[PDB]
Write an enzyme that holds these catalytic residues in place. Structure first.
Site, PDB file in Angstrom:
ATOM      1  N   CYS B 132       0.848  -1.189   0.000  1.00 60.40           N
ATOM      2  CA  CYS B 132       0.000   0.000   0.000  1.00 60.40           C
ATOM      3  C   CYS B 132       0.889   1.246   0.000  1.00 60.40           C
ATOM      4  O   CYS B 132       1.417   1.635   1.046  1.00 60.40           O
ATOM      5  CB  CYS B 132      -0.932  -0.037   1.198  1.00 60.40           C
ATOM      6  N   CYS B 135      -0.363   3.960   2.226  1.00 66.45           N
ATOM      7  CA  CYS B 135      -0.113   3.724   3.644  1.00 66.45           C
ATOM      8  C   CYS B 135       1.349   3.992   3.999  1.00 66.45           C
ATOM      9  O   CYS B 135       1.644   4.784   4.900  1.00 66.45           O
ATOM     10  CB  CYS B 135      -0.498   2.295   4.015  1.00 66.45           C
ATOM     11  N   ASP B 136       2.289   3.344   3.289  1.00 67.09           N
ATOM     12  CA  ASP B 136       3.686   3.302   3.719  1.00 67.09           C
ATOM     13  C   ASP B 136       4.663   4.039   2.810  1.00 67.09           C
ATOM     14  O   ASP B 136       5.835   4.178   3.186  1.00 67.09           O
ATOM     15  CB  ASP B 136       4.152   1.839   3.857  1.00 67.09           C
TER      16      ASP B 136
END
Ligand code: FAD
Ligand code: FAD
Ligand code: NAP
Ligand code: NAP
Ligand code: MG
Ligand code: MG
Lengths: 305, 305
Positions: B132, B135-136
């Site tokens: 992701c 996300c990261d």
């Protein structure tokens, strides 16, 4: 200077949009309003926002949200947007005598819960006066409370609340109801609900918490006092779409329309999230989810340019 | 004993549904799975979930969610549902050799991110292997990373990631791409993206964090090693709709279809939330928002019965 994105509003939708946009390196410019922090800034305990096993106060949660947006680089301005020009590749917001521009705009202006406008109402919000049975109904177990309104919200709030309250007095300013027949008949069938039609609240009494309401017959003017420890106002909501009326397509009740299950409005480059759009769920967690979606929509749209 | 509602799944969607249903006094029975807690239970730092100015780990956030559901009375079972019968006024779930029944069912089974299935991949998740970019991606500033896949996700993840990474090597097991021409041409135009076609990862190397990938040409079998400190797997998602196939209507990719902007499925009394439904945003906060919506839908539907 044309920013990638401007966000208008600082409830859960606007701050979640700001967190995602800032973490995506879009340097979002956020106009929070002078009454910033959204509707939770005006409540006490928030217990149904997932992630807090013991709850958190509304202002505590919104300050976390705000500091989170700041941490990733959001430019937050505690100022109201007074006018917008949303059509075209460069959008403008006017803040007093200052102008700011952006390629994308995320509308997160929320909706106002309609107020009775009577003494005691504001002072006792979070202290026995509530606007949301789903949010606070839990706290009135075995108490005598009132619900105000004659529409589907009032009927839904009243019937839902009887799983907690000892009794619910439904107060309506006329003898005819806007509620659907089904909703009206559900409330009539409920043994814990008593109706007072042609009745309005003129004052909410309360030592530090609600102790009673002063009532007035809207036909005869007869007044009296009712002992209750909770007042649920369910007289409707007004989406804060005034800025964008005539630019973005609205439904007949003034909510901003969006395309499918996305946050795209009728205007290219303009996205909308939270209770400005949603007239169904109206929770902090749903507004936060839609604010995230608006920022992902905006980022993808910006990449297409 | 027929419960008001059974929830299947224990990610943000299922736990938020459980919190709302329990606080609404529906006594929800929740089957969490043996691999409970959803996708965040398998990551480290979660920084874009609004409400945590300094972040929170995935397991910490999910434990808050779980204890919150417990506090309001949810009955949580760390067991997998093996089969369901969802048609009719009484729905049944089968858990091993035990059966449970309910008037309403909320499907919150999520979607699995597809895995390479190579040594090092699971061990280094949250340690340089990610699924992701939203996300990261933040955490790989000025690093050399890879993205794996040949579809729109891989193209979107790769192009998005170049705002952080020093370089992105896009690895695909063939020389033809499933991505749209627009997405493929965006990645080709990006000066920080290098393609390796006819290439697969056979191993992810990593001291405690990712240090390199072992590669293999899918045509010639030639192998080599690439020094990188991040691996983003973008080879698609599989909604966990196997339980309900043939009962609830699915789209061609297996996601549960829902009515309009609600959580109602094609079956009366059955509601669906989270990444089982949403193939667009796929975040914890959006899944949580939809879980809340599913419980409000379910409560309103139950009241209509
Ligand atoms: C008393 C009360 C208690 C509640 N308790 C709960 C609860 O316990 N749990 C729950 O889930 N939900 C609760 N809610 C509902 C929840 O707060 C709302 O659903 C949610 O905040 C909607 O968020 P939003 O971002 O769309 O809009 P809002 O919360 O309304 O935020 C909009 C913000 O944007 C600002 N703004 C508007 N226009 C402008 C403008 N032109 N320029 C600059 N700024 C602007 C506004 O002043 C406001 O601060 C409660 C609501 C109330 C009123
Ligand atoms: C490594 C990783 C890191 C991530 N980091 C972030 C981040 O930082 N921020 C963010 O917003 N999002 C992040 N996400 C995405 C986010 O976690 C998901 O979008 C979100 O969890 C979707 O939640 P959900 O409830 O729909 O489904 P899931 O999270 O998939 O939860 C479903 C749960 O239900 C269980 N279940 C499934 N079937 C059954 C069954 N038959 N019976 C019983 N139980 C069942 C499952 O085992 C699982 O535990 C990350 C995802 C991954 C994989
Ligand atoms: N079916 C559901 O599950 C559900 C649930 C909630 C809402 N809805 C829908 O949402 C929409 C809006 O519903 P709503 O109930 O929130 O609003 P509404 O339909 O506009 O009704 C608002 C009620 O509040 C009264 N009111 C307004 N201002 C008042 C004031 N200052 N003092 C006293 N009373 C006041 C109104 O009385 P008057 O009649 O005199 O104006 C009216 O009865 C509707 O379409 C409804 O069907 C549906
Ligand atoms: N336009 C957007 O903004 C956007 C963004 C994301 C997704 N989407 C859409 O979402 C849907 C799914 O997209 P997706 O990219 O996630 O999945 P996808 O279209 O199914 O493509 C998956 C890619 O991963 C490869 N793959 C699968 N398993 C693999 C393995 N074990 N090892 C190596 N490679 C593997 C596949 O290679 P093969 O070709 O050989 O099978 C394929 O190229 C699509 O419709 C897409 O258009 C759109
Ligand atoms: Mg406010
Ligand atoms: Mg999982």
């Amino acid at each position: 200077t044309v920013h990638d994105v401007i966000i208008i509003g600082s409830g859960p939708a606007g701050y979640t949009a700001a967190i995602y946009a800032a973490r995506a390196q879009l340097k979002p410019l956020v106009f929070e309003g002078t009454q910033f922090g959204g509707a939770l800034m005006t409540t006490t305990e928030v217990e149904n926002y997932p992630g807090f096993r013991e709850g958190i106060t509304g202002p505590e949660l919104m300050d976390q949200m705000r500091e989170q947006a700041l941490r990733f680089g959001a430019d937050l301005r505690m100022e109201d947007v007074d006018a917008v020009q949303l059509e075209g590749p460069v959008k403008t917001v006017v803040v007093g005598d200052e102008t700011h521009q952006a390629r994308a705009v995320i509308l997160a202006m929320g909706a106002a819960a309609r107020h009775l406008g009577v003494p005691g109402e504001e002072a006792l919000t979070g202290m026995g006066v509530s606007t949301c049975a789903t949010c606070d109904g839990f706290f009135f177990r075995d108490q005598d409370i009132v619900v105000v309104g004659g529409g589907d919200s009032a009927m839904e709030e009243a019937t839902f609340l009887t799983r907690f309250a000892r009794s619910v007095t439904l107060i309506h300013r006329r003898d005819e109801f806007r509620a659907s027949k089904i909703m009206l008949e559900r409330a009539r069938a409920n043994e814990k609900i008593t109706f007072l039609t042609n009745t309005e609240i003129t004052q909410i009494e309360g030592d530090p918490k609600v102790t009673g309401v002063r009532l007035r017959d809207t036909v005869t003017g007869e007044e009296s006092k009712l002992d209750v420890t909770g007042v649920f106002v369910a007289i409707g909501h007004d989406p804060r779409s005034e800025l964008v009326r005539g630019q973005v397509e609205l439904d007949d009740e003034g909510y901003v329309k969006v395309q499918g299950r996305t946050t795209y409005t009728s205007l290219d480059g303009v996205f909308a999230a939270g209770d400005l759009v949603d007239h169904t769920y109206r929770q902090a967690i749903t507004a936060a989810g839609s604010g995230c979606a608006a920022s992902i929509d905006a980022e993808r749209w910006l990449a297409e340019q």
